[PDB]
Design a protein around this nucleic acid. Structure first.
Ligand SMILES: [Zn+2]
Lengths: 121, 83, 52, 86, 120, 200, 50
RNA sequence: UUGACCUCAAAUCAGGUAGGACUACGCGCUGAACUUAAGCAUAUCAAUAAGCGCAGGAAAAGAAAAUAACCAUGAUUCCCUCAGUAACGGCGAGUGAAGCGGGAAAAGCUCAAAUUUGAAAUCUGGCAACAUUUCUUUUGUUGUCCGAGUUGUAAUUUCAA
RNA sequence: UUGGAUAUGCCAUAUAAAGCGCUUUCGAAGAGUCGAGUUGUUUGGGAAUGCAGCUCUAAAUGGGUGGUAAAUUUCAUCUAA
RNA sequence: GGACAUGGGUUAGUCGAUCCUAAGAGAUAGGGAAGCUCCGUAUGAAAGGCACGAUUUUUCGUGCCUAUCGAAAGGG
RNA sequence: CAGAAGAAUCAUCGAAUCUUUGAACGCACAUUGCGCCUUUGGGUUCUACCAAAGGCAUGCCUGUUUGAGUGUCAU
């Protein structure tokens, strides 16, 4: 079985040959299944399918991380790379601009804050 | 007041499949779905048809996104990979 | 176009209608020779620019 | 497929006249000549000028649409617009 | 200099239409070709009528993708089996799957090519 | 300042100056569209005291609303009921035309928040209103502590839910015995609820 | 009729595939409570109504 | 003639935003009839159902153009009480609040109208730098240009002053 | 992972800002809005309770309100648009 | 056996659909409407083009003039 | 059942995929219908044909750019 960690520590072009070889192997296995194949071949069909899925996952994550590195510290970045929590969360006021205050309120909070007090018995 | 001998002339659809709701309720000549109101932006919906609402309301389908959102809410909408 | 007709018929309307004295007093403006000399005085006392 | 209409492919597709190139590039005649000086872009006459003019016979200077398509992505054109703003 | 109007119509003037110069690409990564030859050709057909077409008409019969057309089937066959077809016919089966008859050239033997694929 | 003079002059709208300005403005507002963007407020001090600041993110729209009462939309003026419901003509919309002006502008600019609005003109067919609008996505608004409150999602379509000044006026919000119907559904629901305690 | 739309043939193709008997190895499973297809259709008896 | 400005347009211009669903509970609009009155037209049902619009995790309301007539109380909301009471009603059927008082919870405030005038002190955006992160996904800072803004953006003031 | 304290480190131009106290002083306070008539619709509101349409349209110790309409004169209270 | 089960089976440059318009539908401009939505289809719209030039104050000048859907019997 | 051999029809879940559609957005649609833009690539075939990728809805807001006006002037 193809394991993701040595899949990740290779290059994109090398993984391209592995992906194409796996696709050809799946095509051969499907031809074997329709011409009459054993359970061993039919089990290799699902194994090859998952190996293709693992490789395609590795290509996509390498591509996305490269896009993240290229767009790091950029004011505008691709939408799919931005946050997706909820539509409302993205539309809400940020904590910075929720906490913005006038100089009138800054003076009031500076000079007369809520005091820590206690009462004697 | 004509029954048989009059049902034999019925071979002309008045409704076809709707592209939005998938039901055989799309009036051809009106170009409107009697079920969901397509092509209107809103969905045909009426409070007298309470059973009609529950036949197609939220949860009767897959809710694939809403299930994902609920899982993400339970853990606080965090992003990144665990260390 | 409609906006050009708006401009010109507004100009016509102000000419046709009876303008009140408090509005028509702005139709009597400064003369050219007085205008150039007062603006000559003003360009000596323009306020400082943002760069200055 | 249906009947294809004439003047849609071949010489009538790969060749472009000077005025349509102006409209294609959204440039004035002086500015279009400027980038044609800077880049290597010169008239190229079709072997069948009448066919490349979509049947018309009026005398026309022709450029490759490939050359004009290339001029669409030239950063100098944006610099011309920047100077006009300046 | 008052401009002379000779049309009695005012037609909206033509203004510069800048092309799009985005500050960011909306998609970070371009999708791979969604229909490549391994997805275009699903399986060959080995039914008795399919064999008959192979052994007489020099024609290969394939289960192909729904979105595959005649051009894409020819390119897929050429790239997957190194044999150039001379003719392609397609039909949607009553089960909803597309089937392509691929007539090979006299240069190629459909029997041999079927043997290399392995379903013969 | 000149805003004081503008306010006391606007009080005198039967003067020759205001009557002339009403004529010319009503003519040119009819020649424009029913809803058209106003480049600047025609009553800058009226807009100013209602909440309009002259910075990016604030918008003014002029809208003319057809005056008169409401016409029952029943076909052929027929009601099919008891004689206490046969009126078709002399019926009145319960929201003001100023509310109607606000809510039509609010639909026209769905990306904006309706701050408030003011009367600017009227004739025998229309009453002309100017609606003050705020862009909630604009950073100049999002960073101003005096106007952030309208960016919050609980203020979407204030005018549609009756939360603008004229909207609260139309639904009878007020302090004292004169109202006592107050929030109508809330007040009606408060009494008509039959509170059955556990021990009774 | 012979003249069909592509959309109709898709719905007809799925209707044909759903109008089949159940695999036999389904009936041997642990906790299986399915014996016969309860959604079977015949072309005279029940119409697809599309 | 060039320019300035105003107004109004265009662009697959740069960056954003709106719809739809949901609707138990929130705010509105629109709006009946069966029913009751042993008939029935005012009335009742009901400021309800149906219809339509717009929200939130609550909504709405809210710091008195409020009560009271006291030795006076003191934003709003909800509970109990007031109270089936004052009152409305072919004064018929029926309908029907509020102040006080007790409790739950408590929190206060912001502009407009002022000449900064020895100094637009204010802010969006482009660019470049750094920094920061529930987060390479988030949020800012500083500099520099372009603009917005004197037809008024900051500071100062809100009647309790 | 978060919270409020604590130990110090660094950055912070009070050349600032603020509360309080007395003024022989001054004190800007939101208009087709208030109010009135009228017509609908509402309310327990009854000589209109609120809302709306139309007509008329304020004021400057002025304007509201004090649950029987009017004129007048006081008194409380509150300070809308 | 049109029933039950298992497989198989429909190949197009030329045959149709697609293209065109018909009655008619239906956006847009606008105007109504508390609204759902209604009306409206070249209308009270700035509703788009085409050509010439030693390159013009290397900041463009000079001329010339209607969506869409809707026919497997219509047109092609 | 067959079948192979960090297993699993395991749980969790912060990274991804997410066909044709749908408010549904190029125009449509009882038509896998009809278009346009940019880039790239293909092959006995190269002015041809084809393929792939990325785009083209409306309203409104800030800004930019290009404008129009017997609108207001300056000059
Ligand atoms: Zn439908």
């Amino acid at each position: 079985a193809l394991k993701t960690f040595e899949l990740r520590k290779q290059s994109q072009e090398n993984l391209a040959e592995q992906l194409q070889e796996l696709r050809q192997e799946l095509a051969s296995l499907r031809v074997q299944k329709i011409a009459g194949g054993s359970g061993s071949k039919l089990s290799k069909i699902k194994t090859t399918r998952k190996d293709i899925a693992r490789i395609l996952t590795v290509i996509n994550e390498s591509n996305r991380l490269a896009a993240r590195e290229a767009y790091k510290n950029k004011k505008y970045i691709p939408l799919d790379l931005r946050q997706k929590k909820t539509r409302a969360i993205r539309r809400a006021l940020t904590p910075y601009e929720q906490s913005r205050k006038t100089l009138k309120q800054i003076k009031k909070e500076r000079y007369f804050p809520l005091r820590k007090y206690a009462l004697k018995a | 007041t004509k029954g048989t001998q009059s049902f034999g002339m019925r071979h002309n659809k008045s409704h076809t499949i709707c592209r939005r709701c998938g039901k055989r309720s799309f009036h051809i000549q009106k170009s409107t779905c009697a079920c969901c109101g397509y092509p209107a932006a809103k969905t045909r919906s009426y409070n007298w048809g309470a059973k009609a609402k529950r036949r197609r309301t939220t949860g009767t389908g897959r809710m694939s996104y809403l299930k994902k959102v609920h899982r993400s809410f339970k853990n606080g909408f965090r992003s990144g990979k665990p260390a | 176009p409609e906006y050009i007709r708006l401009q010109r018929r507004r100009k016509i309307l102000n000419l046709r209608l009876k303008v009140p004295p408090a509005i028509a007093q702005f139709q009597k403006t400064l003369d050219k020779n007085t205008a150039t000399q007062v603006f000559k005085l003003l360009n000596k006392y323009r306020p400082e620019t943002a760069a200055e | 497929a249906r009947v294809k209409q004439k003047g849609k492919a071949g010489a009538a597709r790969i060749y472009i006249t000077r005025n349509q190139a102006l409209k294609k590039l959204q440039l004035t005649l002086a500015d279009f000549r400027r980038i044609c000086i800077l880049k290597g872009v010169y008239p190229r006459e079709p072997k069948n000028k009448k066919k490349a003019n979509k049947g018309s016979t009026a005398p026309v200077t022709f450029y490759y649409t490939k050359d004009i398509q290339y001029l669409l992505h030239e950063p100098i054109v944006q610099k011309f617009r920047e100077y006009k703003v300046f | 200099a008052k401009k002379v109007r000779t049309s009695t119509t005012f037609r909206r003037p033509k203004t510069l239409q800048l092309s799009r110069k985005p500050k960011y690409a909306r998609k970070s990564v371009a999708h791979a070709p969604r229909l490549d030859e391994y997805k275009i050709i699903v399986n060959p057909i080995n039914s008795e009528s399919a064999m008959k077409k192979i052994e007489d008409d020099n024609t290969l019969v394939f289960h192909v993708h729904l979105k595959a057309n005649k051009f894409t089937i020819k390119e897929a066959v050429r790239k997957l089996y190194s044999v150039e077809p001379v003719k392609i016919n397609t039909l949607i089966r009553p089960n909803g799957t597309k089937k392509a008859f691929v007539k090979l050239s006299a240069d190629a033997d459909a029997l041999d090519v079927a043997n290399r694929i392995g379903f013969l | 300042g000149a805003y004081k003079y503008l306010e006391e002059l606007a009080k005198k709208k039967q003067s020759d100056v205001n009557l002339f300005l009403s004529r010319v403005r009503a003519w040119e507002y009819r020649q424009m569209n029913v809803i058209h963007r106003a480049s600047r407020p025609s009553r800058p001090d009226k807009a100013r005291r209602l909440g309009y600041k002259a910075k990016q993110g604030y918008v003014i729209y002029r809208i003319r609303v057809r005056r008169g009462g409401r016409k029952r939309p029943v076909p052929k003026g027929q009601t099919y009921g008891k004689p206490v419901h046969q009126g078709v003509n002399h019926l009145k919309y319960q929201r003001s035309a100023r509310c109607t002006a606000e809510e039509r502008v609010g639909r026209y600019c769905s990306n904006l928040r309706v701050l408030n609005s003011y009367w600017v003109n009227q004739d025998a067919t229309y009453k002309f209103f100017e609606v003050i609008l705020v862009d909630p996505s604009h950073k100049a608004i999002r960073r101003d502590p005096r106007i952030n409150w309208i960016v919050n999602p609980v203020h979407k379509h204030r005018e549609s839910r009756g939360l603008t000044s004229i909207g609260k006026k139309s639904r009878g919000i007020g302090k004292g015995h004169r109202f006592n119907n107050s929030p109508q559904h809330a007040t009606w629901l408060r009494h008509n609820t039959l509170s059955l305690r556990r021990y009774r | 009729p012979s003249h069909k739309s592509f959309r109709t043939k898709q719905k007809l193709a799925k209707a044909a595939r759903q109008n089949r008997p159940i695999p036999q190895w389904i009936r041997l499973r642990t906790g299986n409570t399915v014996h016969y297809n309860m959604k079977r259709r015949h072309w005279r008896r029940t119409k697809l109504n599309i």
